[PDB]
Amino acid sequence: TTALVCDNGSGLVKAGFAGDDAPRAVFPSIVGRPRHDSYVGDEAQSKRGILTLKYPIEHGIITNWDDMEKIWHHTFYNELRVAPEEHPTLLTEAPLNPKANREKMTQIMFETFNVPAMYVAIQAVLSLYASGRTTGIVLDSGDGVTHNVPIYEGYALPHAIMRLDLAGRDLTDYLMKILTERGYSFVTTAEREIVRDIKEKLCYVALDFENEMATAASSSSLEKSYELPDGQVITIGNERFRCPETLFQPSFIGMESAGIHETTYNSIMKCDIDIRKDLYANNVMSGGTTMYPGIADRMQKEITALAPSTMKIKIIAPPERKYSVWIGGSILASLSTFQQMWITKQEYDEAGPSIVHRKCF
Amino acid sequence: TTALVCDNGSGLVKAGFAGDDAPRAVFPSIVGRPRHDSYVGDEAQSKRGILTLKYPIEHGIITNWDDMEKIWHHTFYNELRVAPEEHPTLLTEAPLNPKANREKMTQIMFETFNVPAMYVAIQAVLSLYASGRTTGIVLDSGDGVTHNVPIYEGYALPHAIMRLDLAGRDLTDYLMKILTERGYSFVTTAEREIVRDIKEKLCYVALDFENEMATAASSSSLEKSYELPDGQVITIGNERFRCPETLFQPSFIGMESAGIHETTYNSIMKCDIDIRKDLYANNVMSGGTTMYPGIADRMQKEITALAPSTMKIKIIAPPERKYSVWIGGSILASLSTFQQMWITKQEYDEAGPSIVHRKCF
Ligand SMILES: Nc1ncnc2c1ncn2[C@@H]1O[C@H](COP(=O)(O)OP(=O)(O)OP(=O)(O)O)[C@@H](O)[C@H]1O
Ligand SMILES: Nc1ncnc2c1ncn2[C@@H]1O[C@H](COP(=O)(O)OP(=O)(O)OP(=O)(O)O)[C@@H](O)[C@H]1O
Ligand SMILES: C/C1=C/C(=O)O[C@@H]2C[C@@H](CC[C@H](C)/C=C\C=C/CC1)O[C@@](O)([C@@H]1CSC(=O)N1)C2
Ligand SMILES: C/C1=C/C(=O)O[C@@H]2C[C@@H](CC[C@H](C)/C=C\C=C/CC1)O[C@@](O)([C@@H]1CSC(=O)N1)C2
Ligand SMILES: [Mg+2]
Ligand SMILES: [Mg+2]
Ligand SMILES: [Mg+2]
Ligand SMILES: [Mg+2]
Secondary structure, three states: OOOEEEEEOOOEEEEEEOOOOOOOEEEEOOEEEEOOOOEEOHHHHHOHHHEEEEOOEEOOEEOOHHHHHHHHHHHHHHHOOOOHHHOOEEEEEOOOOOHHHHHHHHHHHHHHOOOOEEEEEEHHHHHHHHOOOOOEEEEEEOOOOEEEEEEEOOEEOHHHOEEEOOOHHHHHHHHHHHHOOOOOOOOOHHHHHHHHHHHHHHOOOOOOHHHHHHHHOOOHHHOEEEEOOOOOEEEEOOHHHHHHHOOOOHHHHOOOOOOHHHHHHHHHHOOOHHHHHHHHOOEEEEOHHHHOOOHHHHHHHHHHHHOOOOOOOOEEOOOOOOOHHHHHHHHHHHOOHHHHOOEEHHHHHHHOHHHHHOOOO | OOOEEEEEOOOEEEEEEOOOOOOOEEEEOOEEEEOOOOEEOHHHHHOHHHEEEEOOEEOOEEOOHHHHHHHHHHHHHHHOOOOHHHOOEEEEEOOOOOHHHHHHHHHHHHHHOOOOEEEEEEHHHHHHHHOOOOOEEEEEEOOOOEEEEEEEOOEEOHHHOEEEOOOHHHHHHHHHHHHOOOOOOOOOHHHHHHHHHHHHHHOOOOOOHHHHHHHHOOOHHHOEEEEOOOOOEEEEOOHHHHHHHOOOOHHHHOOOOOOHHHHHHHHHHOOOHHHHHHHHOOEEEEOHHHHOOOHHHHHHHHHHHHOOOOOOOOEEOOOOOOOHHHHHHHHHHHOOHHHHOOEEHHHHHHHOHHHHHOOOO
């Protein structure tokens, strides 16, 4: 009778119960199989030694359905320890998820896990809701994808969504590369996990990119120390802000794309004149890769440079924004008016999987 | 871009545009065909002379689909003069309408009249909404059927709906019968229309049934005069309140059913204890046959006799209650939140007619 909320990301699954303010289970979105029997999440991780690890979700889209069933089987029976036939399930999807994927998702829930009711919601919409608004533009930068999504009264505007395949995992690889400028090798998937850790702990977004580079090459006060697992210590300086600077200048990594400040602006510009002003004042950050200190001040300054000079620009960057999608679905799944909007097994029996596209809002 | 609202009753079609406070077209729900080429509504009526008249809706349910298409064709092209491919259409249905009927209704709208979007709503729910409430019990007595419908937050409670096949048309026939106690014959479908007219103009609900009969047989002050079309005049006395008294005592007409005060009570009693009190305080009358003067005071007194003696009983009987279903749909179709709940042609293409049962609320 409690609803389950499951948020499937490229990197992490966040799953739990509606009514909570945090996912009970967060675990790597991976399936592992013997190098020449399958393991999931945290499982797969303890034995990575003798497995090939596969990610079933790439850039926010489900591409391996057999593995995804195993992530879902693990989520219900091992992580949450519930019987799925007893619980309405809310699932999340990427903006612009293909219609065919969303139907396949519905079919699996109903025919393989026998849920009484499910729903599929766009991630960025749930994060807007978790901030208390129904109109806004969300910047959702996770592990695999970054999406700008303008939303008006609860409804995502498909023609103005921007997709940038440049996310947290790319920033980790770019940190690996530049650290092997001050002499370090990382290269293995294990050492990659170490650099991911450094990234999350030491990196930050510089208020002015150049001046910051001038500073780091004039005093040792930006260097920080970091202990590796083998005991050895490493020093990190200018790499701390150069790594995330990539989101503002993708040419750092050889991509020809606009940075996250320009896609935000361009997405606002694909909207009707009569709401632009509401979008400028309600930019919401969401996802793990928006956690860098300085990123929200940085965003404010860049978007004010591009927008008409009299526009009121406000960046909202809540402290819980790494889980905001999940918390959004926790709130939504608890509303009594949401209860009539679940897709029930009866509705699916009578109409089949394409029922899933009548969102009801 | 304006929505159409069409309310199909056993006797009258009420049709018009969302945003209005009254149906532009009210006309008899009849199809006429040459006694040995088809005519509708008011049409069929001017030539009844050489046609057989058929009612395609009986006791609120559509039973002749070919005729019903002609009522709908006439509604769009002759009465409202619009192109149906250009307008979302809201249709109404009886409580407990079979699933199969509602699908057939959807299929015709989409495949024969090519509407962009439609919706099918339960009549009694729209009348509740027109009174400004989302919780209440509606007594809807029309020409062909009477329905008691308890509704909690906008949703009709199917297991407590009561259906009584005793409505305005039966009261007309019973008035014909008792008038041929003071010497008058009516018998033909034309004279039936005359008695219907007398019914609507002269009849009323007595506050105490017996005392009223005692009164009419003690002074000529209750008789009223009525001019027939051929010039002759008729006198009506005790028949004025005996006719509608039938709704309270169906044995007047040989039926073994409970009266409208008992089905109301029984329907309230099939509900959960924790809302009964809200239903007792929000009884809404709706439909042509609730127009009799005195009926709402009458209802108050009868339901107070049956309910627990400390209950607060309130009867709401708005002046516009003969059109309240239509006005309900006029309001609903205008809400911006309703706009995402239309069934679109795309949704119907992908899922077919059984899409219609995902009500969204
Ligand atoms: N404090 C932090 N600073 C910078 N990055 C971080 C921080 N915390 C987590 N991240 C990064 O956020 C990413 C995980 O984020 P998230 O759970 O939002 O993504 P996801 O939903 O799995 O993937 P996606 O939305 O791309 O499909 C990882 O790359 C992780 O390193
Ligand atoms: N003032 C009135 N007093 C008594 N009865 C009336 C009055 N006005 C209309 N009626 C009756 O109301 C009936 C028409 O009501 P209405 O339009 O609500 O029914 P309907 O929707 O066609 O049919 P139903 O809901 O049974 O399918 C007719 O029987 C008509 O005689
Ligand atoms: C605390 C934590 C955060 C996280 O987000 O992990 C996701 C999950 C993960 C799966 C692969 C590795 C082997 C496995 C184990 C597990 C652990 C927990 C990881 O690979 C990412 O690391 C990629 C690689 S490098 C990067 O930047 N994203 C992001
Ligand atoms: C002003 C009006 C109200 C009405 O409700 O009519 C509906 C429609 C109607 C159809 C049959 C007759 C021949 C046709 C013509 C038309 C006219 C308009 C009628 O037959 C009813 O009369 C029945 C018969 S007797 C009664 O009580 N209900 C109710
Ligand atoms: Mg995500
Ligand atoms: Mg990879
Ligand atoms: Mg009616
Ligand atoms: Mg008849």
